[PDB]
Design a protein around this nucleic acid. Structure first.
Lengths: 51, 239, 150, 62, 89
RNA sequence: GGACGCUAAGCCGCCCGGUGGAUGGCUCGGCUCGGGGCGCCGACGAAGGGCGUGGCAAGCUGCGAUAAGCCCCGGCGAGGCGCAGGCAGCCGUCGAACCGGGGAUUCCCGAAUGGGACCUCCCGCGGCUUAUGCCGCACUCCG
RNA sequence: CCGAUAGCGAACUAGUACCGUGAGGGAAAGCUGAAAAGCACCCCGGGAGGGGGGUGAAAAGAGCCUGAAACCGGGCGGCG
RNA sequence: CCCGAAACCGGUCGAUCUAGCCCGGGGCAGGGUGAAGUCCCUCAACCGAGGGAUGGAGGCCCGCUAGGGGUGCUGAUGUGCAGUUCGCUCCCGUGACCCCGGGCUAGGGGUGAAAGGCCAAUCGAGGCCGGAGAUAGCUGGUUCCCGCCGAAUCAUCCCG
RNA sequence: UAAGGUCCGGUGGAGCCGCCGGUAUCGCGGAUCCUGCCGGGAGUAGCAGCGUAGUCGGGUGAGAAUCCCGACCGCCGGAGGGGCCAGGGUUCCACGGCAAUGGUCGUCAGCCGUGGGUUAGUCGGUCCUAACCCCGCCCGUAACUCGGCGCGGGGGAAAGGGAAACGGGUUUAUAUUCCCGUACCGCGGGGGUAGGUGCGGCAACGCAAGCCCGGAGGGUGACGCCUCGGGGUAGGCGGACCGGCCGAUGAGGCCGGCUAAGCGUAUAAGCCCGGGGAGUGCCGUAAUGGCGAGAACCGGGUGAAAGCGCGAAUGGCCCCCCCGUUAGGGGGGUUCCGCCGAUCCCUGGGGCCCGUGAAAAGCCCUCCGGGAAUUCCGAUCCCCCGCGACCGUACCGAGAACCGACACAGGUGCCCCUGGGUGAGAAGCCUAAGGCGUGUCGGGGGAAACCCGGCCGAGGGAACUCGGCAAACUGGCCCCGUAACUUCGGGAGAAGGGGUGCCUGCGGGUGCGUAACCCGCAGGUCGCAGUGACUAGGGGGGCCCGACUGUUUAAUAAAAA
RNA sequence: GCAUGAAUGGCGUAACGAGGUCCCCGCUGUCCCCGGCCGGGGCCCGGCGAAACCUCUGCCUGGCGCGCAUGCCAGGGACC
RNA sequence: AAAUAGGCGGCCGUGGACGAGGGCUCGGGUAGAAGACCCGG
């Protein structure tokens, strides 16, 4: 496989998946000048990653 | 200075200098659960097997208590032999009885050190002890060394010789075949010579040829100085 | 996004063929681009737009001609071969053939009754030691002995 | 040995320890049964030291 | 797969599909012997096959009629020969 | 022959525009000191940690699938909905937001304790109920 | 007493980002304006960029208060 | 006044690098040569002698099979393609072989077919933190102006 | 004198001094100083070197040498390709984009943004035990998260063992799972019957497979090496037929023609059984060899794959002719005859040994049989009803998804070892299936000098040089022939000589009836040359050392160590 | 024997060797004595883009000087 | 480019008028790393 992902590790991976998104527009208007996108964006070649 | 040496590692329990104990299947006891006395016990030679751990012939004996244990095989053994134990055993080849019932002048093996422990002396393949002299005070037996040891006649022993021999020490032929023996045992091999191992590794030698200290060493010296001729009383053989 | 390398890859699994063989009319690249479904691809196959060239081997004519020589014992030689002893058939391989027939011959001659019980022993012991080469050779040796007629 | 070691072995691959659950560090040794960031699988205390090494990291981490 | 090693329970043959694609397939155990272990002869009559499969395949190829099927018929011809010898005398 | 009759490239200073982030003012932060308080808590299942949770949620903060919260009392009491000053939408003035005390729920992991375990999962009793729901239990003391 | 190449590593999502098998190691990132009025509408530009015009101050128009030097371009004055 | 090096000692962390051992598995085209054993055929009364077959051994040989090692060119490269590479050449290729996964041995200790070699880019004794702002007779450096006087580089002792 | 201060003009748009007495993390030119910013070098080197790939039309677009489609040409071809183990974690798929990223380039993309995709009783994990580990109790230690003994318990294999599943279809992305067909595991019920608490055959032995809680016992699970032969069929290739395509000449080639897992009925050499009794003792294998614990010789019984049927006239390929701009579809036919060669899969002998070669889950039998006790009982035999607590499944798996900071030529396991020609080869080269043209910069120039790979050189034959280092040379294969020395094995492929292509007619060997093959011979005959390419050892002696094979300074030292 | 010697092994040795040394034969551009050809570069162009190191300069010859100078001193050459 | 910078002969001038020589262009080299040189048009 890859071996292997237990039930909780899919949850962790899922948290990690969320972070790799740019910050949405509605936040920047709400702050009222501005919030830069800010590094928690994930690659897949370049990412080696302690636990 | 130097570090722990080759013997000093063995005692530690180091795994290079530890025997395998799971390809081994040995030991011999006459069942000391019913003491030296008591005829209560007989068995049948179940098999003649190879013991893998002593690389020697062994006999399997099946007792009438229903217990399977090894007894060191005699010469001339054949399956379906009866071994008897107790003082009420007849004096016969491969039968086991206390020393007192054993007459002098007969080949014997597997003698007890202390009465009721199933042997502590003479358990080697093809090697046998000879009963030279007998006294009800103490029974003198002649060892594989040649040294007369006194034993108490309550000790059990078996009549016969031990099978095999010429097969527990025969020519090694080559390095490959020699190597196969050291896996069957536990000896550190290949081992180089001390003389051109450094004075850090080993007390003797340097980088060049030349010893550093003489081989024969004091008996009252500490550990880590037992090298060369250890507890020697004399050395060499020519002038 | 305007792949079109994928569209080929699908038509190709349906046709059970390689990707490189699927041919798209250059005039109708636009019709294959708009098709984003297998069901659309399957229609285009029927219209001839998207087609299959079947998979292709290679010609064996020239092999058939060398083989025709080689079967007749022609086009060979020791200048024609880089094989060693075994190519010739080594000492076992030949002998395993020769003895296995030779024993069947002796058996045939017993049921024909051209050899008495007395002959049989000699023939068997001889057979073991590699005297024969084979069919001709047994016939000559027996005839010679003149125990074909006992 | 000698510099130039990083092309020889495809290491790290498969670990020699795993992710803890008493601290989540990647040090709960699967060939023993001991945690070397806080003690677990052999222990009921956390590590108790006045170095500070651990205690300080942990407080900042907490 | 998990092993692809050639093994004693993962040894493999090529098999055809219906479509003539041919996929390789895995095997497990292939017939093994059952032994008397009280004479050099195996017990005659007894199936070969995987040993657990034998629960749900004849337990009656495994009992030719005779009180102990785990003694060979030649080996039982001896074994009667003793008990009766013992009994006569 | 001397002449500025054409001396390009370039050198030096200054000027103007850019680059750059120094400089000054600014500071919901540090740092030190003085006074007082806090002065223990946990198998009656702690602290710590993990993963979720918001209309839109990337992190933080707060909570626990009752999920930026629920209830009770007393106090202050007329606008709120954390960081975040968007829109939609939500609730209160017939008592919210907020503050104090007390309570409900308070996942999984963790002393974690029945066992194993990359933070998950499975089980043997007994109470219980429609019941598997649901509640108590199986490491070590003393009766 | 110190003040954002200082004072806690950290005044701002910080012991965060990040590195290391691990133990452990470890940053940078403060300032629009009175009010966002944070630029409608129009010309041009493939153009979301930029430019023209309208933007109280815009040389406060988006890490935007102030805006140094080194440095780059053109020009002026002298030399060649 | 400030900086600058080799260390020592205590407690921790490392055998995913690499050494060896154990356990369960995997891999090696093809060929040559032809042992011992054993048979047959001819020749000989026999003794044997010759040929042939049979049989396949060897820490054997050959090999762009797979794989392993890494001798020369002191080549190419040498602010590299690469913190160890490329081509050619070379040794080994059924073996005291190689190879995977689990487990085991830890710092004056291991491991070592023995080089003071190796033990995670660190070994004539690993890394981490604390002691600790270690100590130096030793190198470098120590910031605003002005006025006045203005040197000694000799003498005794000292593991100096 | 100065350290330093003051004033003016512009900018800036809110705070700021002097005087006196105090205070110190109070004034810098340098520290191979620390930090930030910036120039020269340069628009140079690098974007060439390794087995070296694009080029012409056409489509799109703001823009096209490198995005796509078509044609043509390569490279890789048992392995810079396919499937997987580890690892990665979304890289997968889809749609929209080009500021950023790709050694140039970009409309493309794994980049950026946003949705969506992994569905399991019958695959594996879990489980078993292994090497071996940990916990509690006792004990030690002043003490411990330290330490091991003696007890008791648990853990421990994603390449070992295991009760058990395939094929087809479909999706943009998924599937042994979803769907469809067919098949099936284990336990719990029910309804029958073998069961007259098992029925038959002289026998080996046949089974619609022995009632029975308990405990005991006994087999099978269950294991090192390497030859030789027996068997199985996926499957390799020619001929003929049926369509399809290619087609100077109309020939020859290519291509599709298929049958799964699950079952039923049949296997057969080992191995048992009778008759018979081994005559100079007979008979055999490829061989060693078997025999009074049973020959020659005759019958039986019994336990591998195989065949056939069920599965299944389905289903699945391959085309052809009609609808239809099109949605969405319709109708057909072919779906075959052989013979012959192997990877692999199972079965008998045989040699080998001072390594003499883990265990348990699980099964099956047997001893005893509690009870029910023939009104008995049961359901391994059927058929029938119910079920499977839990985790995984996407993609890559690599000269861009691992790992080396990196898209670093590196370097890491298994299977594909059935592709053709070739030939002894799982070899070379050529050519397929299959993959790619991102082995990610191009274009130009009589293109000089010179450098890196690499080819040819007259006459001479090492004069060069520490040294023939480096290169050259032999060469493949078959025959003949071989010295000094010798531990009689070896030296030995010593040394040295000779042949080898192609066509035409025959022989032996294997087979089967001329099909399929293998090994030689003769005649004819061309060239400068027949291992013509590729592949492919130069040889000999003396002296020193270490006997040998092995090992050593991973990474200057592979040795006389 | 400057300064050998018997298991801190001596002498010898078949077979073996990516071991050290020497000689021969064959062969040969290693050489006398050099030339031409092939591919990748070089050189030019578009796009992409560093580094080492950096008080400053068009020098030469002598003398001097911490005795081994562009810059002092005396000569000499000098368009960029 | 000998700064004593030379001699001879001929040709020429006289964002915002007019324009002698000369190059770039083309076809090739006796020439040739870029450039230049040379010749034809």
């Amino acid at each position: 496989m890859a071996r292997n992902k237990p039930l909780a590790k899919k949850l962790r991976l899922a948290k990690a998946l969320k972070q790799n998104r740019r910050v949405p527009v509605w936040v920047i208007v709400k702050t009222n000048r501005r919030v830069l996108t800010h590094p928690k964006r994930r690659y897949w070649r370049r990412t080696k990653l302690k636990e | 200075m130097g570090k722990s040496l080759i013997q000093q590692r063995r005692g530690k329990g180091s795994p290079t200098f530890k025997s395998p104990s799971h390809r081994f299947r040995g030991a011999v006891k006459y069942i000391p659960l019913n003491y030296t006395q008591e005829k209560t016990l007989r068995g049948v030679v179940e098999e003649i097997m190879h013991d893998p751990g002593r690389t020697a012939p062994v006999a399997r004996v099946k007792f009438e208590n229903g217990i399977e244990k090894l007894i060191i095989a005699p010469e001339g053994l054949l399956v379906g032999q009866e071994i008897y134990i107790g003082p009420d055993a007849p004096i016969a080849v491969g039968n086991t009885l206390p020393l007192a019932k054993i007459p002098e002048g007969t080949y014997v093996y597997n003698i007890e050190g202390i009465p009721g422990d199933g042997g502590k002396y003479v358990r080697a393949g093809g090697t046998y002890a000879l009963v030279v002299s007998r006294e009800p005070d103490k029974v003198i037996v002649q060892l594989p060394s040649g040294e007369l040891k006194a034993f108490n006649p309550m000790c059990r022993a078996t009549i016969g010789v031990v099978a095999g021999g010429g097969r527990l020490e025969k020519p090694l032929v080559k390095a490959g075949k020699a190597y196969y023996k050291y896996k069957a045992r536990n000896k550190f091999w290949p081992t180089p010579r001390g003389v051109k191992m450094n004075a850090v590794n080993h007390p003797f030698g340097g980088k060049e040829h030349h010893p550093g200290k003489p081989t024969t060493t004091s008996r009252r010296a500490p550990p880590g100085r037992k090298v060369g001729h250890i507890a020697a009383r004399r050395t060499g053989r020519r002038k | 996004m305007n792949t079109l390398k994928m569209q080929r890859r699908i038509a190709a699994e349906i046709l059970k063929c390689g990707e490189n063989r699927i041919w798209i009319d250059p005039e109708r690249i636009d019709d294959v681009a708009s098709a984003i479904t297998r069901e659309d691809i399957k229609r285009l196959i029927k219209e001839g737009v998207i087609k299959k060239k079947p998979i292709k081997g290679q010609s064996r004519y020239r092999a058939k001609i060398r083989h025709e020589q080689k079967k007749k014992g022609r086009h060979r030689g020791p200048g024609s071969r880089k094989g060693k002893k075994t190519a010739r058939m080594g000492k076992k391989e030949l002998w395993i053939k020769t003895i296995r027939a030779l024993r069947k011959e002796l058996r045939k001659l017993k049921a024909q009754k051209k050899i008495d019980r007395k002959t049989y022993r000699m023939l068997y012991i001889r057979a073991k030691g590699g005297q024969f080469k084979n069919k001709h050779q047994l016939y000559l040796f027996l005839e010679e002995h003149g125990l074909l007629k006992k | 040995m000698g510099s130039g070691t990083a092309t020889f072995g495809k290491r790290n691959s498969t670990p020699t320890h795993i992710r803890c659950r008493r601290c989540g560090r990647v040090s709960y040794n699967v060939k023993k049964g001991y945690c070397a960031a806080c003690g677990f699988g052999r222990s009921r205390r956390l590590r108790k030291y006045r170095w500070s090494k651990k205690w300080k990291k942990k407080k900042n981490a907490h | 797969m998990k092993p692809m090693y050639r093994s004693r329970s993962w040894r493999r043959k090529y098999v055809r599909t219906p479509g003539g694609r041919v996929v390789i397939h895995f095997e497990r155990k292939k017939p093994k012997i059952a032994h008397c272990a009280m004479c050099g002869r195996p017990l005659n009559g007894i199936p070969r096959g995987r040993p657990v499969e034998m629960r749900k395949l004849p337990k009656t190829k495994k009992r030719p009629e005779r009180p102990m099927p785990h003694l060979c018929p030649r080996c039982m011809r001896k074994v009667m020969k003793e008990q009766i010898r013992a009994q006569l005398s």
